[PDB]
């Protein structure tokens, strides 16, 4: 989650 947005699809 720290480098790539976990709230994208």
């Amino acid at each position: 989650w720290n480098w790539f947005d976990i709230t994208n699809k």
Partner: antibody
Amino acid sequence: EVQLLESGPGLLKPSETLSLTCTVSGGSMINYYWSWIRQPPGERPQWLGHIIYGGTTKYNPSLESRITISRDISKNQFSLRLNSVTAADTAIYYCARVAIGVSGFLNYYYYMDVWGSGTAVTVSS
Amino acid sequence: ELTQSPATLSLSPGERATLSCRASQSVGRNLGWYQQKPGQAPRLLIYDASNRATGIPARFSGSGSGTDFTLTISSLEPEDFAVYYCQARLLLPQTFGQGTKVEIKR
């Protein structure tokens, strides 16, 4: 106790630029996301956007054109810039910690678990 | 989006408060409840449907999954008369529901 404190000037006129900073104390910035929320008088809170430890941002599409969020890990802070304000940008602005994590296969949880104190922003001629 | 009902609950200190939040599309157990006292920031109350946030009084509980969620206050205290909001994930345009206000009945 992790503590967030909003700072920055709150009185603007229309066409001007809002600039706020959140300072995080008592905890690290890694493994949480970092959001700006605002709440106009008598309305529910509105999520403005967030930034992740890595620097990637995500914004509320109704502000996309005018908003920027940034973070400085060395200084334990993150910031909001909102361009071209109108009277409609009048609200109490909050910085908030977001507890995030995996829930399902391609699902997540998102909770604003630590709130700052709020700063009253007025935009008016 | 999230639909909270009713808008206002009028109850006595001591009684049980039951608050509803319905999500239009399913959100699993990933819904949160927040409490807001006048002139204070909102605070986290319940997360993942049923988990008391750190420090939240045992009188606060949460249930449901998917579509229908409930916040229960077993026995109201003076300090619990406030506005309660639900929120699930990062749904837009409205990430938070409209709020339910729990007022003192007299």
